[PDB]
Amino acid sequence: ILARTFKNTQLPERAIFQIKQYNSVSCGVSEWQLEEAQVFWAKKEQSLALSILKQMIKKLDASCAANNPSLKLTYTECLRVCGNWLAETCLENPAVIMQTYLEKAVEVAGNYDGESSDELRNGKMKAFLSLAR
Amino acid sequence: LSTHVQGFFTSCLRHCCLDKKSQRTMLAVVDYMRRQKRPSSGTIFNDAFWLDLNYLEVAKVAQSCAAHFTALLYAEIYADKKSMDDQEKRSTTISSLSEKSKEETGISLQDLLLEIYRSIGEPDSLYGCGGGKMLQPITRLRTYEHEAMWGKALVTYDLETAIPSSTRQAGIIQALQNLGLCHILSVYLKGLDYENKDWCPELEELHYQAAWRNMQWDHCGTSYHESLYNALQSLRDREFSTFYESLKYARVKEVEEMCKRSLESVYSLYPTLSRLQAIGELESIGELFSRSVTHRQLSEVYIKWQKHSQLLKDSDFSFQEPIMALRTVILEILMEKEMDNSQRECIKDILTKHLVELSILARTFKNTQLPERAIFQIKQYNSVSCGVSEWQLEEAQVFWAKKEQSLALSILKQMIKKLDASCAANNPSLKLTYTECLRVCGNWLAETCLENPAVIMQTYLEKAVEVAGNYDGESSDELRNGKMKAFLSLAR
Amino acid sequence: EETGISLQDLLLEIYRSIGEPDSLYGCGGGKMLQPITRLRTYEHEAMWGKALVTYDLETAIPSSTRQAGIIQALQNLGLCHILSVYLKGLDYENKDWCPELEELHYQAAWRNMQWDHCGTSYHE
Amino acid sequence: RMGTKMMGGLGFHEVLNNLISRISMDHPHHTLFIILALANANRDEFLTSSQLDEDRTEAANRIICTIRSRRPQMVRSVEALCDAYIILANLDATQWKTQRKGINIPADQPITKLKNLEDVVVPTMEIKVDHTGEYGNLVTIQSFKAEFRLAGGVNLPKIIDCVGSDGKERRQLVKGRDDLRQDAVMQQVFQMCNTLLQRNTETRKRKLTICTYKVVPLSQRSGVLEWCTGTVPIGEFLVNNEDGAHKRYRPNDFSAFQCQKKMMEVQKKSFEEKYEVFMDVCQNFQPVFRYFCMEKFLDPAIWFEKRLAYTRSVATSSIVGYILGLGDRHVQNILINEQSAELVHIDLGVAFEQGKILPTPETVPFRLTRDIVDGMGITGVEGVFRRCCEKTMEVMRNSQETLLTIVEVLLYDPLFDWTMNPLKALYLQQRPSFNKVAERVLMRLQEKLKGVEEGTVLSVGGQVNLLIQQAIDPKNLSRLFPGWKAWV
Amino acid sequence: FVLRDVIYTLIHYINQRPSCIMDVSLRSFSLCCDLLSQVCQTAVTYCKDALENHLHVIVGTLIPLVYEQVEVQKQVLDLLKYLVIDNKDNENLYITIKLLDPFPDHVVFKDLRITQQKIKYSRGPFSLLEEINHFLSVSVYDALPLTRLEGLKDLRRQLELHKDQMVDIMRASQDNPQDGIMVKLVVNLLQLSKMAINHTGEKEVLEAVGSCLGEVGPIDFSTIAIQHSKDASYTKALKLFEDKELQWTFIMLTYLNNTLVEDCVK
Ligand SMILES: Nc1ncnc2c1ncn2[C@@H]1O[C@H](COP(=O)(O)OP(=O)(O)NP(=O)(O)O)[C@@H](O)[C@H]1O
Ligand SMILES: [Mg+2]
């Protein structure tokens, strides 16, 4: 994250490689895969980042059952980021963007009822802002 | 017949290897049966199923036999048949079809399509199939090399260690070479030799390529680059028999290697044609080197080189760069060794013109390191005199292309300031350079909004027209082009 | 031509000593084409590819600072294995090593996690 | 712009007339028909408005007389040929409506008597311009065949054959009771776009061009155009009733008539009902266009080449049509060549986004229906199509000043009737101040040639993605006129 | 049939021979050459257009024997002079002599090359396109790359000093790149190189092909798929027959007629 903030694209790739050295992709996705997608987006490789995020969302659609609050936060953040990226790149019509990504993130954040936390409030705020925009 | 032919094809794919001739015979049988009308009329799609065949396996076998278009057509037929079969069963994207094919046949449709499109060589079609495993480092590296993104390719090659070592160092050397970076490449090669004495043939060929490109004449089934290095060494040592023998051997080897393969795509011919052109140019310059060197012979050689470069206008950069590099090496060798009678001034002029042309060609293909190296080489032999030349303007254009506008503007303004006092309407070429520089400076200042329109007109755009016209260097073709450009800029 | 000191170079040196970044853009009228000034500008803006290309291209620059800049640019772009092989080749081609090159060698050794190397510098 | 008001030593009309006369002197074969079209603006009534029209007619007559002062034979021969064309066009041709084999031309028609016209080249050929004044070794009209075919349509255009001095036949389409000047202007635009595309290495390597045909207006109401031989409309190949591709390859799906009836009966309904009916129709109507190249090129190499050419033609045509705001792109207005598999666009009356003013507005930038995408292969619009569209859009963006200049020259042409009117709107969709408008069209075009879409600046890739996603959007396709045949 | 069989039998007998020659081998070779000369003379005298189908193979077989021995050089030289120089006035043989490969650059072939160049340039000087078309038209005759060895050289000399016309050729071929002449020439050269593998003197043929291909660099041909040349007469004859059995009969009879001239007797 710090390296992306300073417009550096090689150090994030090296860090992602080091993460992949010790971590293997399990049934459920983690925050570092989303970070890898963000790095690929920052490197102006939009198709690969979109493919990564779509695969991650597809895995999460069946893997999770409102069990882990951190997994839920990752899921809603990934949905919001995918919706925003698709809106930015004009690769989807607004109807699908609302139905599948932007409203789904709000529904996941709210209905799952993982309340009484500080990170959840931030995620809910971000999802609400994206849908409103 | 259907079950037996399907068994034959799955036995071919089992690998229990089979001869290529039998596979080609069965492929010919399938191809002939594809074009025959069935007793039940049907359609052309119905005529492709005289036998109950699995066309994915046939496409894979055809790809193994270098029948790329046939493999593509068979893959399309298989996908269509699978879709219709599913539609019958119910009464899907490429990824779902690929998974189904992998879990029934063991071959994924996406990988086969990617391999076929890579074999065909059409660039745009490489973007159509990227649904699966596009995150894999080798696919990303191939994509980076295709788009000439050498920094990303170098970073990815260095980062990934699971890649096999030989191709890893091959890609690292190629990326270092394509970014300039000659001394770094040489030190890297020396370190690689220190850390491992055993060397694979491709690394040896890359080593010889770097040796002959970097002009280091101390290195002593010959490969193409080894043959080029030996020929250049013999040319320097004035041993012409070995020079001609090496060139003939390299030509024969290249032709034999090209003719052994099965050819279906034109894109498979271009590297061989480029290598043969380089060999022919070296051989042609050999005779000129052997005897006395005159101005007329050098001018004629440069004229033929320019004509053939014009013929190569639409060719890719990967096929044009080695020829330019060999031309530069030949010119430098001819300058440093053969010249002892003050004739090297003409060779210096020719080399400067060639390097300027190389800089222009490299800028056209969005390359920013090769023009800088060419400008450095020009500055090595040429010193800034009282009057400016075309290569200084080329350097300013290179700096502008590198998105460094202030430095290019400073260079051009200094050049204009020197020309304002140096020239007195004496040299027509100097006048053309002056008016072109004035026009370019005016256009750049208008683009960057660093000057008000009044000064832009008074000092640069109208001054260029006045210099082109009033000086009366008429009766020429370059002057008309310069006058046209100045008039167009002022009108705009 | 009267005192022997040019105002632009003195101003550039003073602004470099002060360390304020933006002020480095105010004085560039003269000798801004010089390779060392261009390399300093590239390093200031963290344009490591251009800095590496210019460092490799120019040979009139003194050798020690040339290899120092090359190593720094290679390090800042990642490129750890390439840097290690380059250092090994540099050691092969020249046994004599200046202290700054030794310090850079120790920096690369501790950053790349290669524990076989055995007025001590900071990186040593 | 010819007239007789501003006359004098430095008058605008004097200089314009002198320049036009000089151009006609140097290149008669490129300007004499154009001048005669203005001279014969109202010859249809003779053989069978404002002050500007009368001034233009008189100036055209002056120019014709000046030309005749040097080339009498050519002028008289071309005038006779134009009269023959107009007389043939004005023929009723209503009794042979059902007949399709061929009808002999009546003997009273003067066109059957014109033979050996050595001074007249074939009007529908593309005559190359040579900088030398002398024009030599050019194919000239020498005979006309005695029978003419009929082209399917309400007005029944006439298909005739002309045999030139080289002995080879050329097919021409004679049209009456329509305005062909707009088609000629749009063909000029297409030629300019082809010239722009040719001089870029990226689009020259990919051979990206726009297919064009020659149009010659003879009067204000009739004209003659070049018939594209070896081409078939995509609608006739796809949804023909007895031998359409859909019927032959998918007998169990909905017929074209059933889909048309289903879509016509839902017009006066809500948008969700339209959408659901359209989705249901698309479910039982699958594309079959991919077989077009499969049954005509059995050699895999030739098949691959033709498919690539088709995809490139589709991409170039889509981008160019979006830039010019081309509309009314239905199945009967697009032809496909049976030899090169490239697309040709005809009937270019609706342009500059005038199709969005129709009561049922067009909501797509170009036609990218399921058959068009299916004809591209398994990849669809993800491979060659997207890259070619991006290259064409980069070419258009890099040459925006010239495009604005050309469109500015065209839009202020007094004789170019490009704005939509209620009569044309009613005729187009039948089921069984000018300065402000021109300025707004120019503003929209300037926005198009930059990245400004919906007020935000977009890159070439982003703009191409937006156009593609708008063209294939099912909600957009369900809301169009049933005559556009979105399901096809 | 008898004439073709005798000519091909003699050609096969000549084409194979031991490197060491005794008296009996020399006598057999002389007898074979004398029989071939007599057959050729009788055929050309009795019928003017008899040898228009076998002239190229006979000349290509006779050419290498000129500079291998002195005693038999006289006989092959006389036969070549009779075939070319003596019958230069015959109209039927004029067109087939026009389509012959140039003779090797040697003193012994001085008069032969003079006559051949006089016949070739009867209409006038050739342009680069005409030279390439002539080379391609000649290439369809023989299957031995060695006979082409001289012609390739001439082609190089045309490609080196006529690049200005080559630009015009490329410009003209832009409308339909599939039938471009440069890509056709490149494909023909590659096929000729392929046919020369595992044959006597393949290195010289490969070197000549490499020089010719080096005279034409990696020019963008605006094509992707390489199309191989096909016989138009074969296609027309195929389209003559509509029945499947008749087409099969035609194909089989064509194959049998082609294989009737093989070396093996079985
Ligand atoms: N240039 C051409 N080349 C080949 N076929 C053509 C050409 N122009 C028209 N056609 C065919 O002729 C048919 C008749 O179309 P057209 O003459 O435009 O009458 P229409 O369908 O009523 N359009 P419009 O006259 O504007 O109302 C078209 O559908 C095409 O199939
Ligand atoms: Mg129409």
Residue numbers in the entry:
A (entry chain C): 2260 to 2392
B (entry chain A): 1862 to 1876, 1899 to 1974, 1984 to 2112, 2121 to 2392
C (entry chain C): 1995 to 2112, 2121 to 2126
D (entry chain A): 2526 to 2573, 2591 to 2974, 3001 to 3056
E (entry chain A): 1463 to 1728
The authors write:
As the Nbs1 C-terminal half is unstructured or loosely folded, we made cryo-EM grids using a 28-residue peptide (207 μM) that encompasses the acidic region and FxF/Y motif of human Nbs1 (residues 727–754, hereafter referred to as Nc28) and human ATM (1.2 μM). After focused refinements of the ATM Spiral domain, we built a 10-residue Nbs1 segment (740ADDLFRYNPY749) into the improved density guided by the unambiguous density of the side chains for Phe744 and Tyr746. The Nbs1 peptide adopts an overall extended conformation except for one turn of a 310 helix in the middle (residues Asp742 to Arg745). It binds to a hydrophobic groove between two helical repeats formed by helices sα39 to sα42 (denoted ‘s’ for Spiral domain helices). Phe744 inserts deepest into the hydrophobic groove and makes van der Waals contacts to the side chains of Ser978, Arg981, Cys987, Val1021, Ala1024, Phe1025, Leu1028, and Tyr1034 of ATM. Of the two acidic residues that precede the Leu743-Phe744 pair, Asp741 hydrogen bonds with Ser978 and Arg981, while Asp742 is solvent exposed and uninvolved in ATM contacts. Tyr746 is the last Nbs1 residue that contacts ATM. Its side chain, which is stabilized by intramolecular stacking with Pro748, packs with side chain and backbone groups of Gly1016, Gln1017, and Thr1020 of ATM. The ATM structural elements at the Nbs1 binding site, including the hydrophobic pocket and adjacent cleft, are nearly identical in both the apo and Nc28-bound structures, indicating that Nc28 binding does not induce any noticeable structural rearrangements to this region. Additionally, no significant changes to the structure of the kinase domain were observed when comparing the unbound and Nc28-bound states. F744A and FRY to AAA mutations appeared to disrupt the interaction almost completely, whereas Y746A showed an intermediate effect. These results indicate that Nbs1 Phe744 is central to ATM binding, Tyr746 clearly contributes, while Arg745 makes at most a minor contribution in our assay.
